[PDB]
Amino acid sequence: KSTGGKAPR
Amino acid sequence: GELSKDGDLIVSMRILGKKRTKTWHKGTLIAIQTVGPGKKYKVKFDNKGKSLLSGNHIAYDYHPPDKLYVGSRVVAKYKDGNQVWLYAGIVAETPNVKNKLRFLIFFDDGYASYVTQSELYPICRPLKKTWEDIEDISCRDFIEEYVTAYPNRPMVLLKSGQLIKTEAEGTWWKSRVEEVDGSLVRILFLDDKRCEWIYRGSTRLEPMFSMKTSS
């Protein structure tokens, strides 16, 4: 699954 | 500690349950048991298996009636391309004009999408602070901040064709705004050529990050 989420890593 | 009911949870009802894969599946509630500090719900899945589940790991097999609010704990259709799963999340926005009467869902893994009323299901016994069962600590933290701050939602105004940097996996990438839909923007990563829908208040978007870093 491709998501980068809501905030920077 | 066996029960045939617990309020509106009745042995024999249809239900959704969370499997160890973290995807959710249709089944039947076959038993209710008090075990130490709380109740456990035994679900027989339609396709395969049985699980004993806490109340935050079962969902009603019906669609919510204005019953849901920002912060509601839900299971929703997680559609990314041609793949679909039932997956847990939080209601981030309720139906309105700007969103064409959809629900914005922030899923437990960090994904975001709009869904319709017929694509979400209320979790039966959410925790009082609904984010406290989100396993990923970055997601959990984000949702607590978002729900607590609501309705103060700083966002960036972006237009189709605009060029910005967008963060992913620790790197800031050249990107392009392809489409705006309510509180989401479709970002094309220009080196990769993949798209992602991102919340317009996310600090993954450079103009939003920069505002916060200075503020």
Numbering used by the authors:
A (entry chain B): 9 to 17
B (entry chain A): 190 to 254, 256 to 405
The authors write:
SETDB1 (also known as ESET or KMT1E) is a histone H3K9 methyltransferase that generates H3K9me3 in euchromatic regions. SETDB1 contains three Tudor domains (3TD) and a methyl-CpG binding domain (MBD) in its N-terminal part, followed by a split SET domain, which harbors the catalytic center for H3K9 methylation. We show here that SETDB1 3TD binds to histone H3 tails containing K14 acetylation combined with K9 methylation. Crystal structures revealed that K14ac recognition occurs at the interface between Tudor domain 2 (TD2) and Tudor domain 3 (TD3).
We further solved the structures of the W358A mutant in complex with H3K9me3/K14ac or H3K9me2/K14ac peptides. In the W358A H3K9me3/K14ac structure, K9me3 indeed was bound to TD2, while the peptide residues following S10 (including K14ac) adopted the same conformation as in the wildtype structures. The K9me3 was bound to an open aromatic cage in TD2 formed by Y268, W275, and Y277, where W275 was rearranged compared to the apo-structure to accept the trimethylated K9. In contrast, the mutation of W358 in TD3 (W358A), an aromatic cage residue of TD3, led to a loss of H3K9me1/K14ac binding and a strong reduction in binding of H3K9me2/K14ac, while binding of H3K9me3/K14ac was only moderately reduced in the peptide array binding. In the ITC peptide-binding experiments, similar results were obtained; the affinity to H3K9me2/K14ac was reduced 18-fold and binding to H3K9me1/K14ac was completely lost, but H3K9me3/K14ac binding was reduced only mildly (2-fold). We conclude that both TD2 and TD3 contribute to K9me binding, with TD2 showing preference for H3K9me3 and TD3 preferring H3K9me1/2. Depending on the methylation state of K9, the methyllysine is preferentially bound by the aromatic cage of TD3 (K9me1 and K9me2) or TD2 (K9me3).
